[PDB]
Design a protein around this ligand. Sequence first.
Ligand SMILES: [Zn+2]
Lengths: 195, 175, 98, 99, 1111
Amino acid sequence: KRLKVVAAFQQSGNSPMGMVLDAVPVIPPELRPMVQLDGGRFATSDLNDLYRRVINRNNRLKRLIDLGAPEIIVNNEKRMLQESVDALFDNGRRGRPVTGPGNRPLKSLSDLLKGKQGRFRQNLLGKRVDYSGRSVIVVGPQLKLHQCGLPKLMALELFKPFVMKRLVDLNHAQNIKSAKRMVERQRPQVWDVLE
Amino acid sequence: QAITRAMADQARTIRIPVHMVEVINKLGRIQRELLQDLGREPTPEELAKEMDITPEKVLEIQQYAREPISLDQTIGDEGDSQLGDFIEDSEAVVAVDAVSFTLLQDQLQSVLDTLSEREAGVVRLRFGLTDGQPRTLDEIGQVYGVTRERIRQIESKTMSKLRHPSRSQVLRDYL
Amino acid sequence: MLDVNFFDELRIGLATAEDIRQWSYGEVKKPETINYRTLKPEKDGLFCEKIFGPTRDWECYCGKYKRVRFKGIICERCGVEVTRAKVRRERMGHIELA
Amino acid sequence: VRLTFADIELDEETHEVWKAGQPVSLSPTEFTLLRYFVINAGTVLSKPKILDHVWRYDFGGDVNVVESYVSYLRRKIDTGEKRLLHTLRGVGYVLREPR
Amino acid sequence: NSVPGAPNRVSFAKLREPLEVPGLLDVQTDSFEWLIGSPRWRESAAERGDVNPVGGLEEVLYELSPIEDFSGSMSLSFSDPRFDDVKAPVDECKDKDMTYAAPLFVTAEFINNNTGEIKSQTVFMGDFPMMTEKGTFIINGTERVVVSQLVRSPGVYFDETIDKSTDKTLHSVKVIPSRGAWLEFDVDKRDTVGVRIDRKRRQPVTVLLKALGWTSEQIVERFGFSEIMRSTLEKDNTVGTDEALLDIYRKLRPGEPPTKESAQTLLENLFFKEKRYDLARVGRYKVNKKLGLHVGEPITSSTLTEEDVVATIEYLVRLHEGQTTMTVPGGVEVPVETDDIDHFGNRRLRTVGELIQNQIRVGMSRMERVVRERMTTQDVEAITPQTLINIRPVVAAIKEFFGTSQLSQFMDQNNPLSGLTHKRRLSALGPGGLSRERAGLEVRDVHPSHYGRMCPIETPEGPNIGLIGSLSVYARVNPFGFIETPYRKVVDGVVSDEIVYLTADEEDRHVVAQANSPIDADGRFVEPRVLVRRKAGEVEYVPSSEVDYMDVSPRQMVSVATAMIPFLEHDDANRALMGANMQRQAVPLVRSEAPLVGTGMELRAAIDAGDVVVAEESGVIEEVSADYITVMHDNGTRRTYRMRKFARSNHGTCANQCPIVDAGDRVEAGQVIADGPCTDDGEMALGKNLLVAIMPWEGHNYEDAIILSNRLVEEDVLTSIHIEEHEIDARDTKLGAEEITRDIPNISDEVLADLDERGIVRIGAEVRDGDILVGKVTPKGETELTPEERLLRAIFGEKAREVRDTSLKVPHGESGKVIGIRVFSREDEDELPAGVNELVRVYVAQKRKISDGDKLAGRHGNKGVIGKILPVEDMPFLADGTPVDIILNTHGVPRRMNIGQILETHLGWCAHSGWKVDAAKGVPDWAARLPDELLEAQPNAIVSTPVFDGAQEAELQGLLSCTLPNRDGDVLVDADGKAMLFDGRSGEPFPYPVTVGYMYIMKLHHLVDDKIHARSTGPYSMITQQPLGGKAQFGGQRFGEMECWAMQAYGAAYTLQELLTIKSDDTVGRVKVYEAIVKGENIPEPGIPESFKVLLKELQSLCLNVEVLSS
Ligand SMILES: [Zn+2]
């Protein structure tokens, strides 16, 4: 059991130095955004809280070490720094998970890759797509095998740019900016050009 | 003192100076102590007297005291979705206005090519079309070997011939 | 590295401190994100405009440059490079632990 | 069609202003600043916005011009120390009747 | 009947109910009265336990008092909880969206023990929300209902387990007390005992028994017969009470050094003190009853007693030994048996009173902590009760309970039935309950103890199946939270009219009999052996002289919603469940015709729903009108009833209320006055009566589809008004303010013609999708003004238009007229939120006709969308020429075990036609048991049928035999039930007869208009550039990985690539493809998805060196 890892370390040119950590990277801000929800209320990705915690712990450790402190205080601060780091990487892996308001665990980096809510299974294997819709089905006994019904409004919204180019090509609306209101007002000349 | 300084400077997601959070805390204290003495939440006007400031500043304090919310909490009654799934990216490209703008600049260049090439260059350099730098009249003169007054006359010619309704109709619809 | 859909290998390994400080576009040293009044990022904060790049397109923090003519050239006053806002999605920072 | 606020009255036709009914003449750009203010009375104006709109985009000068101008408007119309044309530090200038 | 305004509903009931159903809202009204302490509850408690008549608020206040200080020279007490009048009436409060509440006042008592001081300050505690008459709380204007929940009742629970090694029946017990530490006693694989305390898998009984101050002498005195414990006592390895105490402290509270007193005080502080462990009063009673400790002592001292641990140990050991009766020294004998966990005798009902009291208690404790903290720091003798009391935590706790707690959700009102069943329903989720994933198959079942307590039909069919249920019609809540039902008692074959109420466990000792039994008008049953239900759920035959109890009536094991289904006993459990579910989802029509065939519960349900106004006091009617009714009482004074017209419901349904009285007809107290949304003549009416053909028709009704006649469209038979509310907020911003004006930049006229000069729509102007609704002008700010704009402004003279038109656009897929404007403003001096200056709520209504795709369903669970709306010519029609109304597929009837629907159809046709049984030459044999006044009936009469005591098959056959014609001589429906129909298309008669009749059909709230969605290019999320989800935004269908599996199976690689790259993720790909199908140019190659890059960045920032290698 020990060989199946030490041999892997030996064969590769990977130094185990990185297996312990000396500096921590910071994810780009857009992936941890703070979007101002309308009404003045803000909203953050809860990673910023963990980043603030680890930055605070690091800054306090710097102050204590360069000020001159009892070893108990410095060791305790190092312990909290370690705890903040593991909470950032893996919330709730050990000890009580660090919660915020409302008594709920905070999302860590590893929490973004687990289960059906993770990046993989939710946003990479499956995705929400454009040019689509959903409706109720009814029996189509007068149709053929290859045929299928489609609601008129549903088709109109689905084939938007197609009818724009077709109607402008047919000179329905001199310009596509006009074609916007041309189709959204659902004037009668859109139906035949849609068909 | 150390604990209070830390709480003021470091415990808030949005940083607030100590002078401001002191008055925020004083407002909270006076409001929550006046609730018992009045049995009714006071409209700012009245707390303005205690703070000796205008109620507008009290309202500004109140709307500044709110804290950001989290984007991960489940907003549904049952647990199936997150709040961030309902947030629209404002900076995202609508992909229709950009295409519209491409044909729009095509229409612009077609319309201006109707005008004289000298006038077309004048307006192009005037509003920064070829570049992002609109230029002063002296630059137009030195690139045309002409005085600034004649470029003023040229600009008069351009925006007069431009008002000619054939151009006006074909450019008006695109808005 | 430049992503033109010509890939033959996806290699993953341990990330030493040297690699992460090679990736980083600066060091974060302040737990501040957004000013409570101007609603703009601070200096050396979690949303550092200088480190992670400009927010507005072709704009510096101090407003010295606001036009597409400047490209790639870094402002000498605020230190913000002038480029697209997608670098805020791309660029990443790092923290030096004591 | 004339534009009014408090005691300031504007005529856009022949370019003259009324401040509670006594004559006044005023400089062109200062007139344009007052026009931009009254047309956005009830909205605060930010300095870069003003130099953008009323002032020509190629303005490469400093910023102190706008404060000199608004000082001219104050000394012309709001002679008192407290004014109807309020100032917000770093946010620009606006036309408010004081509460 | 027995109701003053009751329409005559002749019923096929065979036996008389000894009692009528109680007030169906009592499960909440009674609890709230008990919590308040109102005289209404006071008088009831005066005869049902007046030994300790105490209100819930009174109880918690007495529990907290007297709070003390550290030393004991200072003390404070609470007493006399009094309320005041409501701030505003219900309608006014709902209109201006505050919370319906009344002030709370409690007289504190500050006592200075050292010297003696009394300070009786009357302290304001807050605006306590109050329950309305309907039982619905109002918070911030909306209607909220707190649903009762089921939890494990605190107490002891002996369980038995198999070690699967030597077939040894192991035993265990779990003392599960609320707000306390768990204690587990059991027998492990060997013959020792496991006494694990706070999940520490060690410490046999020896250490605890010695830690209770006992020596081995008393242990061997008590236990000489238990070989299990004697051996454990021999291998104690620990001697001395101090040794046991320190061992327990070591294995329970490590890290701190032990002393001679640390463990001694810790043991008392853990289980014998009320500050860290206190099973509730119900828990104490449960322990007493189970162990037989106390039987005639007032309930007090909720903390655990020393006798309890010894009794539990003895009970567990004797159960392990295999005994049957255990007797504690000093208590009555009790049976020895393991305790089931799903039996209703062990599952409580935390109703609204208990939940509100618990949240009040946590707020009480928080403010008490604050009071204690201030009670020492502040100087003595300058102290008033106002100084200590901080009411913020209490109001915060109650407000946080009412909002954002799944135990208190929206009051769904799409019909009165939904409102009724939202209350009187039992949930299993929430704080202290179990989640769906936590729920095993044992919880979701139907325990035999549910009979009469909880209905086994009414249940959501989704993932919450078996967890959320509904209370029965006759059930009642006992004072301790146990669900209690009444039952008749029988002696020596004589049933008295004495009605006793029994809990779940009480039914074990007795024997309950059949609900419908052959009573001989003296109580004796013709045969001795009668189907009865025994203790353990076994149903066997028992001689008549042996049974001691018999059920109150049929439909006692049923719920109110599922008591409206006629011929319930003929329907399968699954289809009955489904039909009960769609009963709540019916929408209010514009006529709401009473069903031709129904059950007697409809009238009572309509009256008790609360949305049908009932004349509280009798008298003549002074004047009647659409908007108001004024009744002239018998004594001088009058009463006026303000009516509600087109009031928007919580689910976008109308709430019309039309009066049904005349100008001068005397009315009686308790009589219906005006019908509700789904009521007519004071009884339930959720649908309409329609002609039915059970034949298949050209496949347009294939696979549960339905085809309706366009007459229903023309005659407005099936049409429902839908009120929609749109909100706009005009807040404060560093742009200044948002004005509600008409100065919107760049607008035409034909769109602005129907909008008044005040910034809103004219009342009564039709709008559709995309139209401007409220003009909220906003200063645009400044950004990069395009150079092209600068050129453009000189060609038409357009001004800058410095304001962004942030107006109200009517969203897609809705239209209709405008009802009215409710405008709020700070200038109007209203309590708008901070920064918000104006609030405008516009109401839009449209008349939604029936159309294909709308879901229709009967009461037997037959669902389906509308296959086709075809004209009246194209339908089968009888020899009378009456076109059929609805058509159902025959294949769905036998394959779904819902045979009751055709029975209802036959009965409906009989009621529609009428009958005159020819009892001239003696009464017919089938009609002999059939009651009087039923042999004669008028056309379009109304009949009733109780769910289990209803019309039999022979009675239906007899009714079908006599089917007197309408106007001519024509018996269209023959004796067997079928009828002759001619095709409306070809015109030839169908070769075989088809059954016809009238069935009740209701529209469901699953209209196709609210479920149609399409999206070309909408918004995208922040983190990933994928589109959003849901009809509220532009949406965009989700393409899950299972669909990707089918994509791969076909091998259509390019289609999957486009779907995952350019229709979802790649921004540059998105704009490029849009440009492609506007320029008519070929669609370019997909790029690199952005979500993959974002994943790469998370991996890179997670300290994982990840690099993509070109070669
Ligand atoms: Zn700069």
